[PDB]
Design a protein around this ligand. Structure first.
Ligand SMILES: C[S@@+](CC[C@H](N)C(=O)[O-])C[C@H]1O[C@@H](n2cnc3c(N)ncnc32)[C@H](O)[C@@H]1O
Length: 420
């Protein structure tokens, strides 16, 4: 209302140009602020432009010099500490150049990320989805960074970081904010740090989106990808995001069947386990491990990775195909490979039942094992979803979690049907 007008004046001040066809709004959006079409917009049409000088990053912030100098000491797994420090500084700086931009940020105490749920609820509602494991990894990293890197830096520079921002609670919130708002510019292999992009981060997300961002030398442009009728919300794409990633990083899910990009994971070692099951002799077991190490050699599998299965097609396509091939090939043929190019081809809803029986059997057994990692079967979740009055009675978190589990189990059951 007031903050929106103030933000738009700031836009004018920093050269951020919005098309007259778009409006920043809180009415009729899927969530909080969003952008709507004042007038019908056509595909290819420029929606807005953001000068690179208006981005908020470790480089444009007022302590960019100090941060760059100390880059080595600020390294971490995420690579997000300098941006986080940039944010913590600007937030406590009396004359921050981005104040009107911050004014549109969500209430930091009300973020919906599962990292903010009680651990029991998280573990209970999201078992098997990959979220609980990702979150505990996040919390571990956050913890080490804070005590060994961030807090000491802030304390080494009292003038640049006031007391009110030396807060673990705040640090957690800002990590979540970066996860859900920041943009990472593609390279061209030292990946670009994430940056905050004003205006662009007003747009909500859909798998079926109608806008996307383009990078240029001097600016970022948000452009329409489909026509957008008058009064309709303008949706960016945050990526090809499965529900488990949306809930983890953004604190929301798309209800079924909306998320055409949804996926399920089969752990790579679970396929190995399935292969071992069918073995009888300890000598058969080791040929399996032999096959496995050859696949690790080829960098097609790894002890900690997962194959990724989409609704219509496998995403980790060559990895899975190459694994199935190598695991099911005659012992003889495998000798000639360990001595003397990877496997091509797609794996889709239509292709999979035409694969060799042995590949299908291996895939089938790995899927059964994956489905066993969840607390309940598909039928239970399908029951909660089919009856809308029962669904409506679940808490918000339970609804979100059910959508993650359901999306994943449906994909896995589809694959179960396809592999007979
Ligand atoms: C880049 S911000 C988008 C602007 C945001 N609506 C706001 O008011 O600040 C990303 C956040 O918006 C929300 N969001 C984006 N798309 C959504 C969707 N399709 N459904 C529900 N929430 C969504 C989530 O809270 C997510 O963390």
């Amino acid at each position: 209302l007031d903050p929106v007008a103030c933000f738009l004046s700031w836009c004018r001040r920093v050269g951020l140009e919005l098309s007259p066809k778009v409006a920043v709004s809180r009415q009729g959006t899927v969530a909080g602020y969003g952008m709507v079409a004042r007038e019908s917009v056509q595909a290819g049409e420029l929606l807005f432009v953001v000068p690179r000088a208006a981005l908020l990053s470790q480089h444009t912030c007022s302590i960019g010099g100090l941060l760059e100098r100390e880059r080595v000491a600020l390294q971490s797994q995420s690579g997000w500490v300098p941006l986080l420090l940039a944010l913590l500084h600007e937030l406590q700086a009396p004359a921050s150049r981005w104040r009107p931009y911050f004014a549109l940020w969500p209430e930091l105490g009300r973020l919906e990320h599962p990292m903010f749920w009680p651990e029991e609820e998280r573990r209970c509602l999201l078992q098997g989805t990959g979220v609980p494991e990702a979150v505990e990894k996040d919390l571990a990293n956050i913890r080490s960074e804070y005590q060994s890197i961030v807090l000491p830096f802030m304390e080494a520079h009292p003038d640049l970081f006031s007391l009110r921002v030396r807060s673990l609670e705040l640090y957690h919130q800002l990590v979540a904010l970066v996860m859900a708002y920041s943009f990472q510019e593609p390279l061209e292999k030292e990946p670009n740090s994430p940056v905050m992009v004003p205006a662009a981060d007003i747009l909500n997300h859909l798998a079926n989106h109608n806008a996307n961002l383009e990078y240029s030398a001097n600016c970022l442009r948000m452009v329409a990808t489909q026509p957008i009728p008058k009064g309709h919300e303008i949706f960016n794409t945050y990526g090809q995001m499965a529900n488990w990633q949306l809930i983890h990083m953004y604190g929301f899910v798309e209800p079924y069947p909306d998320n055409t990009d949804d996926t399920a994971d089969i752990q790579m070692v679970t396929v190995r386990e399935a292969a071992l099951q069918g073995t009888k002799t300890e000598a058969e077991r080791h040929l399996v491990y032999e096959r496995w190490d050859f696949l690790c050699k080829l960098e097609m599998v790894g002890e900690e990775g997962a194959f990724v299965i989409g609704r219509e097609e496998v995403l980790t396509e060559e990895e899975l195909t190459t694994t199935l091939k190598v695991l099911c090939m005659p012992a003889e043929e495998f000798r000639e490979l360990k001595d003397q190019k990877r496997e091509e081809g797609s794996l889709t809803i239509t292709n999979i039942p035409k694969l060799k029986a042995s590949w299908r059997q291996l895939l089938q057994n790995s899927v059964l094992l994956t489905l066993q990692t969840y607390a309940t079967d598909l039928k239970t979740d399908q029951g909660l979803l089919s009856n809308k009055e029962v669904y409506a009675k679940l808490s918000w978190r339970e609804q979100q979690a059910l959508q993650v589990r359901y999306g994943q189990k449906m994909i896995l059951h589809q694959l179960l049907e396809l592999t007979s």
